[PDB]
Input
Amino acid sequence: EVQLLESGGGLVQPGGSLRLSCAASGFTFNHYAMTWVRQAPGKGLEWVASSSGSGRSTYYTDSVKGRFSVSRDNSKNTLYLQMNSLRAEDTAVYYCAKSSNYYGSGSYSPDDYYHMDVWGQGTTVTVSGASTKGPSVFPLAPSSKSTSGGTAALGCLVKDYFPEPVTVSWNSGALTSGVHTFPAVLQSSGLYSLSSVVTVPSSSLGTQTYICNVNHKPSNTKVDKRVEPK
Amino acid sequence: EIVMTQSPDTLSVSPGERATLSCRASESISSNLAWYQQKPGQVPRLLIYGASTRATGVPARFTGSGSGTEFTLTISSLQSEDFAVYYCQQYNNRLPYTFGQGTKLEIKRTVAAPSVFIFPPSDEQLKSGTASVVCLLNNFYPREAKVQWKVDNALQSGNSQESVTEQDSKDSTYSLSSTLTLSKADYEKHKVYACEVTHQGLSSPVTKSFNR
Amino acid sequence: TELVQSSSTGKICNNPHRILDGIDCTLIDALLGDPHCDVFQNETWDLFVERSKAFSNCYPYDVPDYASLRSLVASSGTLEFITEGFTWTGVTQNGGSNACKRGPGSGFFSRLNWLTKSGSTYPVLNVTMPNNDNFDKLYIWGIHHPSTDQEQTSLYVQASGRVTVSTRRSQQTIIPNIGSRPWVRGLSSRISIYWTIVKPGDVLVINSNGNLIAPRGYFKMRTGKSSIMRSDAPIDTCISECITPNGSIPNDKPFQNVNKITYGACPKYVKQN
Ligand SMILES: *[C@@H]1O[C@H](CO)[C@@H](O[C@@H]2O[C@H](CO)[C@@H](O)[C@H](O)[C@H]2NC(C)=O)[C@H](O)[C@H]1NC(C)=O
Ligand SMILES: *[C@@H]1O[C@H](CO)[C@@H](O)[C@H](O)[C@H]1NC(C)=O
Output
């Protein structure tokens, strides 16, 4: 099986440098052009840079010229992307992708760029001035203003963390029906915030306990906040 | 600079019905055009190359046609797995690759009014000097919804953010969470905190409010 | 297990197998006559070793049937090229490109002949080369894909070229694909390399009204038991009947897990270590 394994993504200050790696297996690496594709949060796919099979021909999108540099070590079956003087707009998931052949198997087109056969799993780079920080978890308490008939909505507000992502479960995964965990918003401070809500029977608010389990791995933060009616 | 333009930005169609996505190049790319499919949190997958050739393993309900500057991708009958974002792409035309901006293929269903709930700030958060008021719009369709924050009937601007879930796997609705963030001092200056919601499923805007 | 060879020397032994190190050159570039691969002319081998550092430095090209051509030449074990006196009436021969420098000035693949217009005409070329020998002839030729319509007419007059190559058995026609590909060594154009086996009693017919990259002769084919292998291991003066891309191994054990690809008398491959 053809596999593309990416690494090297991380968090970097603006103006910093990062080097991405794409280890290839399952095909004759130097026969195929290899390229980098990036996807900013909630935006489309954007071509970044491409290298020929030999690596002797490289091409770049305008916005990264003089800052990014694509290379490949064909003895190691590895594609590289050196990213210098990173900017906030470079925050994206970066994929490496293998050009397909055109004439079929057993052909040879190292200097041409065809439909993309296989993709890496993606590696995330985050360019920001913010520092790694664990979130503050606040309850969204059930009340008459969140109750419709016999159903009550309650939730958790996970505020001011960096970087993405965080994970939210309810009652250690036992509660899954009616859960809505929203996408994170980037606040003007450079920190993220999200909420997670769930609708439960109002008659259970007196007896059943509801705890949201928040996990921010990039800061080793685990919070279990009991959401109490008030 | 070859420009790849996809239309429409969002295509709403019922499960089981036909869908056709269009892609246009600012100049001729012959048949050097590919279509990719991408679900949220997932790697893109090849569907069509050469404008009309199905990739290996791609079901027969996908078909592509066109040459030069206009291209169409047609799905004869949509299944649940087919609702996703679709990208077209030129390859090998002077520049290695150029993507279109993408078209979201969204599940069409009947109108559903949102359930609107409001949450005052927690007392724990108020002890740290910040007040966040959350408004929840639960299980609505279509996606278009206007959430306005009104504090003593004064329209708020620049102090709130919102985010929307993906379409629910069972009822295909959206849910929206809007958070109004004020300072503690500013929060105590006012009485009525209201969330005003405008949606096609509502005959008139619905306001959810609380005092203190 | 004790029955599975799991370790290699990391080096390729040149005894008893005659090893030819491609260095910076693939077998196909040695076949075509890329200028920096000229030293490989009329070379011979039991095992051709291709390096990952190999590169091309001539006209940017593709090969639609690369793997089959590579295997046929490698199994032959030789690069013996025979020059034939083709008559190309009414065209200019020996075209050169600055993407394929041969010394200080422009150049081309040594085994190929880039034909272009003479005066203001490119006639319909029509040539026949019979195989009256008792061996098979391998002909390497190609077609030029110009980058623009202007380049097409400047070189070949005709707005749409064609290369038709036939034997007594069948006829193959290639039409150029005009268009700008990504820049390689100053060029947006490409060449597609094709090949034809002509057997004793058969003939080669070439007909073209433009874009033909002509053969200069044929490679004298032989039935051999040579091969080719992609490996970065250094060549060493040792002794080994079995060679893997990882390097040489002893062949006394019944099985080996070093590499799927082997050359010579080797143990049978198994996955278990
Ligand atoms: C012989 O070479 C092959 C190919 O280079 C080696 O196979 C890979 O070896 C690396 C070494 O860390 C592993 O990470 C890969 O998973 C291997 N891939 C496959 C498909 O096997 C092999 O290990 C080498 N063996 C020896 C003994 O040198
Ligand atoms: C090429 O020349 C031969 C010899 O005169 C002739 O028989 C043949 O018809 C010519 N080619 C074509 C395509 O007519």
Notes: The domain at 110-212 of chain B is CATH 2.60.40.10 (Immunoglobulin-like). The pocket of ligand 1 is lined by residues C 8, 246, 258-259 (CB under 6 Å).
